[PDB]
């Protein structure tokens, strides 16, 4: 079972390569390609990887981006025992990122606020007003940075006013790319080893 250390090394190379290409697809708004690469990484995760700090950090970011990418699909669940919307799950992953990456509350508060805003607004646009109130109460009633935002969303929910500028001016594309720029700023930017060896093979 020295072949086990061989597969572990290759699986790490493969995981890091497809993570690099998944970030590239997300950056280019090629979310279909991101989905397909995400599914490759999911299947690979059942295999032995040894372990790094790099793998744990990239899998957390991959976890967060995948929930954000599915955030407008309220039929999707990332915990079948829970009843969380995808963007609610993204909030929970962000908190795990804050703890495991040892980030301050000041560094994560703005981007976390963006997820809270999107989580409530998506429920509003699906006319899931009861879920929107539950997310609003849980995640904004205490957050000091979302007090004005909470004030606007409370009236939108009560009036069921999907035509409010807060709802209509919201851009999920802008939200997604802001989240990627934040998450990428906390990761190593090196090119994966498989990519470098591919460039030399095609020379």
């Amino acid at each position: 079972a020295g072949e086990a250390r061989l597969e572990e090394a290759v699986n790490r190379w493969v995981l890091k390569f497809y993570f690099h290409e998944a970030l590239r697809a997300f950056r280019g708004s090629r979310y279909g390609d991101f989905r397909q690469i995400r599914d490759i990484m999911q299947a690979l995760l059942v295999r032995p990887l040894g372990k790094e700090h790099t793998v744990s950090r990239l899998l957390r970011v991959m976890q967060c981006l995948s929930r954000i990418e599915e955030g407008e699909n309220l039929d999707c669940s990332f915990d079948m025992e829970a009843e969380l919307t995808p963007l609610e799950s993204a909030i929970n992953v962000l908190e795990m990122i804050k703890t495991e990456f040892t980030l301050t509350e000041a560094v994560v508060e703005s981007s976390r606020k963006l997820v809270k805003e999107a989580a409530v607004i998506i429920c509003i646009k699906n006319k899931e007003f009861e879920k929107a109130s539950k997310i609003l109460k849980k995640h904004m009633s205490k957050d000091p940075t979302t007090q004005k935002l909470r004030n606007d969303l409370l009236n939108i929910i009560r009036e069921k006013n999907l035509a409010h500028p807060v709802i209509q001016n919201f851009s999920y594309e802008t939200f997604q790319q802001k989240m990627l720029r934040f998450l990428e700023s906390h990761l190593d930017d090196a090119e994966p080893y498989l990519l470098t060896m591919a460039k030399k093979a095609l020379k």
Binding site: R35, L49, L59, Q63
Partner: peptide
Amino acid sequence: XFXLAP
């Protein structure tokens, strides 16, 4: 080890 996709 994580659930990436639904």
